[model samples]
Target: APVQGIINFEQKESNGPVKVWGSIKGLTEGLHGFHVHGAGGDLGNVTADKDGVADVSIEDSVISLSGDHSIIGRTLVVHEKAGAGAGSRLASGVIGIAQAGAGATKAVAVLKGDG
Candidate 1:
């Protein structure tokens, strides 16, 4: 089955590491590729346990929240494998800035039936 869930990215510091964490469901039980497909950010890969749930985290300096190379309006894609053209893309969602009064938790519903 395809994947559907919410992923969140929190910028811990300006021009520094962005904490990436989220839950993806309906995936195969194994390693999956995750990436921020935009300027200056990419989440290499993630693994889902036997329960078909992927709790992914990338605590690195691969993302910049602000500057010439910002990733505010890009896309985050989850692939079936780690390398390019390795497998089919399972899910995807756009990245957006958090708004006031909006829930602190971001939502990314991927391949949810009819978009």
Candidate 2:
């Protein structure tokens, strides 16, 4: 099976951490790995729970969302498991800045099938 949906990000300040959240479908029922990769930082192993969805709050320090550690143009990845040798990269998405009054939303469709 494949996955599809959007991820949203909100930042309070230039030197502050950003809030991340989103819903995704098409993942195994169990603990999966999640993180923001590129530029300033790379944090992972965020659990996705049994619903294949992770709604956890991640701090800027964890992913380097602060000055010189911006997430813009970076990537958010979902892995098969947590820690080293966590299988293959299950899914990924590029991080982008949102427009004013426009909620940040990134759509993803990983997997190929007739649904």
Candidate 3:
């Protein structure tokens, strides 16, 4: 069953680390393989009702960052399963990267769920 929640994340300031906050219901704890998809919406690649349809190749896995904050401004897609060689189901979060440019130091993303 899918529950509703939000990802409250903030881009790091100069020399600061990005912060990821929020809660996701219906997710198995531990390490869930994550990435960024080429399209918009969690339903894009997923069928009307299915699991693992969003499976993407390893080369397609966008980027995963630890507390190092490397993936701050980038979009985040958490998988229902882990990655041995590829990614799994379309979870939640901003589906795309936050645009950056001059004077663009702060960014926030929030995603609602459908279930």
Candidate 4:
């Protein structure tokens, strides 16, 4: 199963300009390959609100950040399995703040897990 949510980068409190980041609560204890996709919302082609509704700004967009900004306003897809010895696992998802004019002014934290 997958979990989705919103991450506001601006509203978040950080030590020095908070960056996007996220994690899986029900992870199978392994590494997951995380990257901000071109768009976010739902799990299909229709996820795009419009031509550029979920666009992410490169000026502030980072595919891989040190902390939270990585999963802000993005969909987290857990792989079918875990990584080797906690090595980077295979988890791919989308982030809605990359497209131009995308409303990523705030970094919101989204979390999902299975029981």
Query: Please, what is the whole-model Cα lDDT of each candidate in the order they appear?
Result: 0.63, 0.53, 0.40, 0.35
Per-residue lDDT of 1-115 in model 2, one digit per residue for the tens? 3654466766555554556666655665655566655444445455555666655455544443334555666777666544555466466777665643233322221222123
List where candidate 2 sits over 4 angstroms from the true fold: 39-51, 62-66, 81-84, 100-115
Q: Pick the candidate with the highest TM-score.
A: 1
lDDT winner between 2 and 4, please give it: 2
Residue 106 displacement (Å), model 2: 11
TM-score-best of 1 and 2: 1
State the weakest 10-residue window (summed lDDT) of model 1.
106-115
Which is the leading candidate under lDDT? 1
Clashing pairs in 1: none
Q: What is the number of residue pairs that collide in model 4?
A: 27
Ordered from best to worst lDDT, the candidate numbers read 1, 2, 3, 4
Worst 10 residues of 4 by lDDT: 44-53
**What TM-score does candidate 1 get on C-alpha atoms?**
0.74
Residues 34-88, model 4: lDDT tens digits: 3344442222111212221222222233333224434444554433244322223
Candidate 3 residue lDDT tens string, 1-115: 3623355433434344344444445544344544344432221121111332222222112223323434444555565554334554555565334455442333344433345
Q: Which is superior by lDDT, 1 or 3?
A: 1
Model 1, 18-85: lDDT tens digits are 66777887777877777767555657767777877888766757665565665666777777543455
Which candidate do you rate higher for lDDT, 3 or 4?
3
Error of 3 at 28 (Å): 3.2
Pick by TM-score: 2 or 3, better one: 2
- Supply candidate 1's per-residue lDDT for 70: 58
